[PDB]
Design a protein around this ligand. Structure first.
Ligand SMILES: Nc1ncnc2c1ncn2[C@@H]1O[C@H](CSCC[C@H](N)C(=O)O)[C@@H](O)[C@H]1O
Lengths: 245, 7
């Protein structure tokens, strides 16, 4: 009975035959990443991934995709974080992100680790996902900056955080977006992303072509006239940036 | 406001 594709604004999609009630429910449903090639294929209920196995979208006939399964028993499920649990599988990487970025020492002095591109990509490419626990703006804005190194606003109601000890990739590597450092001249942006495992989160997307082994940076976008409400290191850099202008 | 990328 034919096949539906639902594209999110970020370029990922859900694809499959819908059931009698018109739900994306079945054994042969897939989520396809924004490369229109990497896919998680298997059992979904009402568009929610129950058992998605890593696959490649090879071709499409009369609108109907063909998937070849990748080796391994890489399987994924919808596993939205809570305020305390960042993931059921903190050490299981996202397979699309794995092929595109890695973590290494930042090239920015005294900035710890940073996120780097594995491959040359063009503009508008989703590179990495910023998943974390979900907490409130009230909580975040009421606590010390020391606790807010990794907080990223998701929307008016929710802030995503990667709190200790999940700021170390030895404890958490299911996503890596929290490892991109700040620049006032960035090559990437944060953008909304609907992820079949993490749910509604943000991703890191290039705004220009990037080379292999280039460090990926984003503007953190703190309020410069709430001086700035920002960590001291950012305040130093903001002064330098305005000076160059 | 103690988080990145607020609208
Ligand atoms: N431009 C910059 N200069 C110095 N420190 C930076 C920076 N951008 C990010 N940071 C550091 O990175 C933290 C945000 S998370 C980014 C990844 C982090 N460097 C890490 O190793 O896990 C900030 O708290 C700050 O410690």
């Amino acid at each position: 009975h034919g096949v539906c594709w639902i594209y999110y604004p970020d370029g990922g999609s859900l694809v499959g035959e819908v059931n009698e009630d018109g739900e994306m429910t079945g054994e042969k449903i897939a989520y396809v990443y924004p490369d229109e090639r990497t896919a998680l294929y298997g059992k979904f209920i009402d568009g929610e991934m129950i058992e998605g196995k890593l696959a490649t979208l090879m071709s499409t006939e009369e609108g109907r995709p063909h998937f070849e399964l990748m080796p391994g028993n890489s399987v994924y499920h919808f596993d939205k974080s809570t305020s305390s649990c960042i993931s059921t599988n903190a050490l299981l990487p996202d397979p699309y992100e794995s092929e595109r970025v890695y973590v290494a020492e930042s090239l920015i002095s005294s900035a710890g680790e940073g996120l780097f591109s594995k491959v040359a990509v063009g503009p508008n490419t989703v590179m990495s996902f910023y998943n974390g626990v979900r907490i409130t703006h009230q909580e975040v804005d009421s606590r010390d900056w020391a606790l807010n190194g990794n907080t990223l606003s998701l929307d008016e109601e929710t802030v995503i955080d990667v709190p200790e000890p999940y700021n170390h990739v030895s404890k958490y590597c299911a996503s890596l977006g929290h490892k991109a450092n700040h620049s006032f001249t960035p090559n990437c942006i944060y953008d909304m992303f609907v992820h079949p495992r993490f749910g509604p989160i943000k991703c890191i997307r290039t705004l220009r072509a990037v080379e292999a082994d280039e460090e990926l940076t984003v503007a953190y976008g703190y309020d410069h006239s709430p001086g700035p409400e920002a960590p001291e290191w950012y305040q130093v850099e903001l002064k330098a940036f305005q000076a160059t202008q | 406001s103690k988080s990145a990328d607020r609208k």
